[PDB]
Design a protein around this ligand. Structure first.
Ligand SMILES: *C(=O)[C@](NC(=O)Cc1cccs1)(OC)[C@@H]1N=C(C(=O)O)C(=C)CS1
Ligand code: NA
Ligand SMILES: [Zn+2]
Ligand SMILES: [Zn+2]
Ligand SMILES: [Zn+2]
Ligand SMILES: [Zn+2]
Ligand SMILES: [Zn+2]
Ligand SMILES: [Zn+2]
Length: 362
């Protein structure tokens, strides 16, 4: 429909989301959108299947790799505050990495998954800090630095860890005591406090059992965040146009810089972006396993470039029991957050988000 208003918007969102929840047996979903910069909220189903607690915009969901947009923002903030420069070698900020392959990898390459084939996940027995250091010290590059994109927890994890260390504070502390309060995200956590536990959904695994994320090496950096639709939309709004702390503004802007592309997707700090308008087929391809999660040679940029407001920025994320998607278009005043307590197919996330974004654009 080519008309706007509360009536067509609700017809579209309910019409897109309700069938999808049935098709994938999603217990609960929180959805929030921006249109002309104004927010609308839709909640469906249950946070906890046993208790029947209903999802609201306060329900906490694991957002998986969407956490990496906050990790990247924290890393950008530390760069703006002078802790490191993006072209710095990684071992300039980790004395224990001098004389390793990380003498030849930049902080930017580590943040953008282009260090040379760091894997999706740490090997299973890299499960302590000591083992982690040995792991990176001994790592042998699969590809030359800057040439290939391979999405990787170890890569963005180390970026966030070292960025925090450059300011002399642990990552979780910097996130919880500085980044989140300055962003005004008061119900967003890496470690959910006992007072907020009643709002934390359970995830429902592929075997249909309750599950939540567990501690792990660089888990905070790679997949640490639990949040609701209202807080996550607030973070989106800070990305649509932020006025305030100059340092935080600069940091957010730095997450909108493009470093290289794979096909029609441009990799920034945290956020991945597209042209806007963008077709459903392109958005699906950019988020498909072949592109998003396997090794690809990149189209290198001569210099990193501010991608600007006429872009669709996005990120997918998942954990064992949860499936999240966020997309926004700063110039157009439109965005979508979709948080669910099932890890359901990214293709379904993208098709639903595209359809809703097309109505928001009217
Ligand atoms: C981000 O969603 C992703 N996963 C996480 O951050 C959380 C985890 C899920 C399993 C172990 S940690 O970043 C690595 C996705 N994780 C996987 C994966 O299952 O290895 C993907 C293939 C998509 S990226
Ligand atoms: Na850390
Ligand atoms: Zn139209
Ligand atoms: Zn409304
Ligand atoms: Zn072990
Ligand atoms: Zn360290
Ligand atoms: Zn607070
Ligand atoms: Zn921007």
């Amino acid at each position: 429909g080519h008309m706007s208003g509360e009536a067509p918007l609700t017809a579209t969102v309910d019409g897109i989301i309700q069938p999808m929840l049935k098709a994938y047996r999603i217990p609960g979903m929180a959805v929030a959108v921006l249109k002309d910069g104004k927010a609308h909220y839709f909640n469906y189903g249950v946070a906890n299947r046993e208790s029947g607690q209903r999802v609201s915009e306060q329900t906490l969901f694991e957002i998986g790799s969407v956490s990496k947009t906050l990790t990247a923002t924290l890393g950008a903030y530390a760069a703006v505050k002078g802790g490191f420069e993006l072209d710095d070698k990684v071992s300039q900020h980790a004395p224990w990495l001098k004389g390793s392959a990380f003498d030849g990898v930049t902080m930017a390459e580590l943040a953008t998954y282009s260090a040379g084939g760091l894997p999706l996940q740490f090997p299973d027995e890299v499960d302590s800090n000591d083992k982690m250091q040995t792991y990176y010290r001994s790592w042998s590059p699969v590809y030359p630095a800057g040439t290939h994109r391979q999405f990787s927890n170890p890569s963005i994890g180390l970026f966030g860890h070292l960025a925090a260390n450059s300011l002399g504070q642990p990552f979780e502390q910097l996130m919880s005591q500085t980044l989140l309060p300055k962003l005004g995200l008061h119900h967003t956590y890496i470690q959910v406090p006992e007072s907020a536990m009643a709002n934390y959904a359970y995830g429902y695994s592929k075997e249909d059992k309750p599950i939540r994320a567990t501690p792990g090496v660089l888990a905070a950096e790679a997949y640490g965040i639990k949040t609701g639709s209202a807080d996550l939309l607030k973070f989106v709004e800070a990305n649509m146009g932020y006025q305030g702390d100059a340092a935080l503004k600069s940091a957010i802007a730095l997450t909108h810089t493009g470093f290289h592309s794979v096909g029609e997707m441009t990799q920034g700090l945290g956020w991945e972006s597209y042209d806007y308008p963008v077709t459903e087929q392109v958005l699906l391809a950019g988020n498909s396993p072949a592109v998003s999660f396997q090794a690809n040679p990149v189209t290198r940029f001569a210099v990193p470039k501010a991608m600007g407001e006429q872009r669709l920025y996005n990120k997918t994320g998942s954990t064992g029991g949860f499936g999240a998607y966020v997309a926004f278009v700063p110039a157009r005043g439109i965005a979508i957050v979709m948080l669910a307590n099932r890890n359901y197919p990214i293709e379904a996330r993208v098709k639903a988000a595209h359809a809703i974004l097309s109505q928001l654009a009217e």
